[PDB]
Amino acid sequence: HLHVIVGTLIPLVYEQVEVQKQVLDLLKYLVIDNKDNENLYITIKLLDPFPDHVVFKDLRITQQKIKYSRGPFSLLEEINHFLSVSVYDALPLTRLEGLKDLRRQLELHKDQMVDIMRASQDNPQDGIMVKLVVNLLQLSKMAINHTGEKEVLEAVGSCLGEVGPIDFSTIAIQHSKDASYTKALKLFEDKELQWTFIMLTYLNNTLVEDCVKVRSAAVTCLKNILATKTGHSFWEIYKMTTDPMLAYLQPFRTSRKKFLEVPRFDKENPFEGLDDINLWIPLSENHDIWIKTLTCAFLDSGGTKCEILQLLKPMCEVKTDFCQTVLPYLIHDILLQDTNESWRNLLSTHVQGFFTSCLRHHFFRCCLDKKSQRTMLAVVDYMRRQKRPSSGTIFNDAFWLDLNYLEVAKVAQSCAAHFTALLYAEIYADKKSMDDQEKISSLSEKSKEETGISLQDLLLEIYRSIGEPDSLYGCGGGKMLQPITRLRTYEHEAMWGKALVTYDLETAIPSSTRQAGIIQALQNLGLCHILSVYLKGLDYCPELEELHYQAAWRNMQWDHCGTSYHESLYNALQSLRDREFSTFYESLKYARVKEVEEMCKRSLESVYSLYPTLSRLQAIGELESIGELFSRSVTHRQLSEVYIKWQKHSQLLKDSDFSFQEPIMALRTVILEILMEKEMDNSQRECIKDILTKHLVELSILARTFKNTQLPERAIFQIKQYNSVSCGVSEWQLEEAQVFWAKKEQSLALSILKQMIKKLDASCAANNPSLKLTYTECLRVCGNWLAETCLENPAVIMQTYLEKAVEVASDELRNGKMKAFLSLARFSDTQYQRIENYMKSSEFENKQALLKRQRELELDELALRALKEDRKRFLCKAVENYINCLLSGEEHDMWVFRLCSLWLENSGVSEVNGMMKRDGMKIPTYKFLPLMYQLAARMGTKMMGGLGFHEVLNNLISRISMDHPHHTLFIILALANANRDEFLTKSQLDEDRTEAANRIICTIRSRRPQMVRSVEALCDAYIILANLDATQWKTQRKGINIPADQPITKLKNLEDVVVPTMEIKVDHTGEYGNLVTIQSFKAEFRLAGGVNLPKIIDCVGSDGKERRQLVKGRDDLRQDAVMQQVFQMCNTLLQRNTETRKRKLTICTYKVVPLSQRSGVLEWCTGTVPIGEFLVNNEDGAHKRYRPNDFSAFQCQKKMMEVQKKSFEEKYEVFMDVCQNFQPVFRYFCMEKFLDPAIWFEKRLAYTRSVATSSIVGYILGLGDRHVQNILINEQSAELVHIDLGVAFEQGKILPTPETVPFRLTRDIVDGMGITGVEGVFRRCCEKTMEVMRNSQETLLTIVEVLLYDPLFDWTMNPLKALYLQQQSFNKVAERVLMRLQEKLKGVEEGTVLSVGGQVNLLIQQAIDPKNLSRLFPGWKAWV
Ligand SMILES: Nc1ncnc2c1ncn2[C@@H]1O[C@H](COP(=O)(O)OP(=O)(O)OP(O)(O)=S)[C@@H](O)[C@H]1O
Ligand SMILES: [Mg+2]
Ligand SMILES: [Zn+2]
Secondary structure (H helix, E strand, C coil): HHHHHHHHHHHHHHHHHHHHHHHHHHHHHHCCCCCCCCCCHHHHHHCCCCCCCCCCCCHHHHHHHHHHHCCCCCCHHHHHHHHHHHHHCHHHHHHHHHHHHHHHHHHCCCHHHHHHHHHHCCCCHHHHHHHHHHHHHHHHHCCCCCCCCHHHHHHHHHHHHHCCCCCCCCCCCCCCHHHHHHHHHHHCCHHHHHHHHHHHHHHHHHHHHHHHHHEEEEEEEHHHHHHHHHHHHHHHHHHCCHHHHHHHHCCCCCCCCCCCCCCCCCCCCCHHHHHHHHHHHHCCCCCHHHHCCCCCCCHCCCCCCHHHCCCHHHHHHCCCHHHHHHHHHHHHHHHCCCCCHHHHHHHHHHHHHHHHHHHCCCCCCCCCCCHHHHHHHHHHHHHCCCCCCCCCCCCHHHCCCCCCCHHHHHHHHHHHCHHHHHHHHHHHHHHHHHHHHCCCCHHHHHHHHCCCCHHHHHHHHHHCCCHHHHHCCCCCCCCCHHHHHHHHHHHHCCCHHHHHHHHCCCCCCHHHHHHHHHHHHHHCCCCHHHHHHHHHHHHHHHHHHHHHHHHHHHHCCCCCCCCCCCHHHHHHHHHHHHCCCHHHHHHHHHHHHHHHHHHCCCCCEEHHCCCHHHHHEEEEHHHHEEHHHHHHHCCCCHHHHHHHHHHHHHCCCCCCCHHHHHHHHHHHHHHHHHHHHHHCCCCHEEEEEEEHHHHHHHHHHHHHHCCCCCCHHHHHHHHHHHCCCCCCHHHHHHHHHHHHHCCCHHHHHHHHHHHHHHHHHCCCCCCCCHHHHHHHHHHHHHHHHHHHHHHCCCCHHHHHHHHHHHHHHHHHHHHHHHHHHHHHHHHCCCHHHHHHHHHCHHHHHHHHHHHHCCCCHHHHHHHHHHHHHHHHHHHHHHHHHHHHHHHHCCCCCCHHHHHHHHHHHCCCCCHHHHHHHHHHHHHHHHHHHHHHHHHHCCCCCCCCCCHHHHHHHHHHHHHHHCHHHHHHHHHEEEEECCHHHHHHHCCCCHHHHHHHHHHHHHHHHHHHHHHHHHHHHHHHHHHHHHHHHHHHHHCCCEECCCCCCCCCHHHCCEEEEEEECCCCCCCCCCCCCCCCCCEECHHHHHHHCCCCCCEEEEEEEECCCEEEEEEECCCCHHHHHHHHHHHHHHHHHHCCCCHHHHCCCCCCCCCEEEEECCCEEECCCEEEEEEEHHCCCCCCHHHCCCCCCCHHHHHHHHHHCCCCCCCCHHHHHHHHHHCCCCCCCCHHHHHHHHHHHHHHHHHHHHHHHHHHHHHHHHHHHCCCCCEEEEEEEECCCCCCCCCCCCCCCCCHHHCCCCCCCCCCCCHHHHHCCCCCCCCCCHHHHHHHHHHHHCCCCCHHHHHHHHHHHCCCCCCCHHHHHHHHHHCCCCHHHHHHHHHHHHHHCEEEECEEECHHHHHHHEEEEEEEECCHCCCCHHHHCCCC
């Protein structure tokens, strides 16, 4: 109670001295002299900081000393402390000092804010920043209509201005929930006991309330409840726990011989009380009396089995909130004991009547208050989560009462509960389909016919309210022709010209909306003068004045004169120009308060509703920040510091939408222009001009990154207006060239860049340190552009631009050197590839064969020698520049694949080996880790010498292993232990590889003997465990004790060995001090099923946590390892791109550690169940629990196996018949696993994105064998994990009964996506992933070329593997596969080049085609 007392006493200090002395000495006794007490030390530490005043100086000093013990606080620790204090809040006004301190901490450190955002990337839902934002919003909500409303609102707006519109990667707002409450609820296993606990907790909380009338009712109810047998059982269960409610309720609990018994009274007709229509449907007002009367009627008349409910009448009579809380429990209790469904029918009829009355529009009964609607929605939501007496399924449990869920969904949408509205719409659609089967556009028109509500329109409205961008595409197609929908689509896609044309053309649209859209489109197109003249013409609604003020402050007119937002901003800027600082600060404070109040008045359902308010608050905060700079004398250091702060906080907004970043940049530009105008000092004016030029260049770059062209041109024009140029060399001219190039005006950009190059060459010989970077960048960009447009021959481009750029060229200089080296290497590689393609082409061989049938031969020999010399020169240049590029940076690290491919192919070339030995060894070792498998498989002992390939490769492998033993030791040892399986139980290339691996192992052991010995022992134990026969316990499923003779049990405390199946973060330094190490193995091991019966074991590490590992014998895991490497590279590519990073598109991966030719170990995914196990299980499959009257999976499999020998027509007919009697059921996974609508929506969206990404990535890699048992779904995250990666690169199409689908997109997979199916989120995510794949075709091609040519990678289909799957020619096969992959990446399908959307449309229609699905193998289970 200390915090409550302190918060109450703090305001009383200012009242008067007479009470000030008493309050001060009481507080001093509370905190000052009590610091010795250990019990209250934590309570004092977790307390609100005292207000900063002279009176509180000693208290503040003591509080700071106590809190900041054991070290200082970081930003994350400060926010955690703020939230922990916020756990208990008596009043919002007591949090003002904490809010100010939090704002100061946030504004002081933003690099720590970047670190926090990076750390929270893995689990965005548990992000600290979004939690802080929602906590602040809730605090501001609680401050409405109180004494300190404006003070709290201003502080909340001040702190929210610091964070700004950061992309939180969340869509659903998760309100804070008590952890102890959930655990206490979990403790009780009986329904009646939980009601008792909840009611007693509510009464205990009510006891503290001020009203004396409610206290008597609360104590009476407590005494009545605790006397009964249910109360005694509750106390017996709950006395073991630790909670102050136990101590508070001790006096009321009494011991009596007989438990208090409630006299059960039964009327002649219990249904007469609740049969009144007026009772259920209230008026517009009088909600409290309505809910009280309904609760009394339920309690007095309806017979309730539970004794606790009957004792709640005195508490229900006084408090309305108690009635609202208890009504669902009363309804559930009455429905539990219902017989003959009389109560069910009556309640269903009355509730449906209430919901229909809510949907009118006055009428006789309509326009009900939102409180009653929310109460009924809470009743429905509570009933949805309760298991029905007849058991059944969650879908069955939804219909406790016969309800038309479309009306309920519409009411929920009207109440701003969008996620539950979508869930109820889905439930209604499913119920309508189920009912129709007994006897969207069709469903929409039917629902409009009977219920008067269109399903498609409701779904569109709900998805618009949610704010998810991708979902809006798949809503429907009924109203696409309407101008309003087209205009909304144009605005969403930033097609401002189309939106402007449509707004001008359509006149049926209301004038206000039409003019607002016209003004917004004109502003977004950069037509500022046209917009101003148009507004002047309109002079012949508040929104019009709002747009007037926005245009006025954006155009700096300064003449166009409840206050709104842009009006406040314009007034603040005008007063800032007029040096009226008081009005400036007052207007900014008023704008803060108004924006925060408007934000907190909303229901706060989705995160996307917070971004505009955050952007506006950030703009206001920046204006207030520059206010003090304008107030005092302007210095260069202050301007540099404020620009650095702006750049950091813009870096915080990297992934934010352009619609939120743009107003901030516009305000910054106006700010800088005003500051330059009001300078009157040449020395500072130059610095202000430089700052404005840098800001405008950054704005141009930002607008170009979002495919915007008018804004960069306007920014360049402003730069020209201010930064008048006569020297003719500057970075903004390079930015102008880039802008012109972005507009597809290549001639102008090339002319500008060549003029800049000639001016730079004439001015100096690249001797100015400031202009060196600009010269190098101009040369490199011009060379790349000329190469792209083919306007110059390769010789001129190489000699004039790229080689010169390298020769011209301190972090910026290092980055420029890296970029120039990469460009030169890429051009040289292009020339080398062109010359090699010509040498390997059929035209060259035909020309050679023509002369095969005398000076012609001499000329041919001379030409061949010249071609070979040119090829070698290009190769050497490319390799050298790649090596130099890898040295000077880390951004282009994935080019190590191309470098290693070039080195490996030309092994015999001494120059390449020489430059790899001299400068290649200086490359950091961690950059070779992704290619460790190939580099280790390529090593041998044949070419031994000073510049021999094998010697250099062995040295590189040894250095990599020395620097990163944890990442490479297992691979090398597995190379050495290829044939140790037979030795443990009882070709020249292979033996050379074994010898090289043994040599590297000997070197590492000479460096680290103990680690090598322990790793060898662990590998031997794993191999011995794998070879153990497990057919004895094949039927066993409860776990089997490992035999004592197994060496694995003996191993203990291996502190030099890290858990092999645990992913390890790459460390540039070679310390690796703090890593989890293997401690012991649990005695029991389980079986996962399958032909070979793999064993699952548990490995407890240094900490208490343990990891499950899958030990596989008689199986090859190297293919899985390399496929996981490909998946990691694709994940890096996806995370690098902004569009795929925003959607969190990733490929789930699991670490695989091969041990021998046929032995290995891999990480076992926890919480993942196979989709086939969930769907078509014989015992408790989803197809059996739901739709039990349909065909069983056994019948479908039998029919499809029987129709195997018949023709294609018979197969198609049988497949259609099976699909008719086998409906999808997979949509219930998220419905039954996640009961909260927001969590359900998030998990379903994650599932859809995972399906899209996995499908696209698998198609790019030609992934096959994607049956039900090879796909797992995580129960916690609802994401799919693809396993058994043996078949890839379209080798499944060579099988008998070839696979004719790019990926698995069967009816269950699409059904899991929701009512929209493949439309909406899935299609757009597939398009984004395919676009990312297209943009990185060269990197993927290099990676796959390195992988395929790996000697140890067995990826070609063979007759033995073909027979097992369904119960040199290698060079040309690999070339054909690479060409097919290149065609896929470029988009060439069957000789026709397609766009990303067209290719995605083709893939989807090929995957979902029943014609292709019918011809597939019956084991693939296409019907599932
Ligand atoms: N990483 C993993 N996480 C979880 N379960 C896995 C994992 N890898 C394999 N399993 C399961 O282990 C069992 C057998 O795995 P597989 O590698 O597919 O064996 P198999 O040689 O393919 O024989 P099958 O599956 O009967 S054709 C299946 O039940 C898989 O779901
Ligand atoms: Mg399998
Ligand atoms: Zn009305």
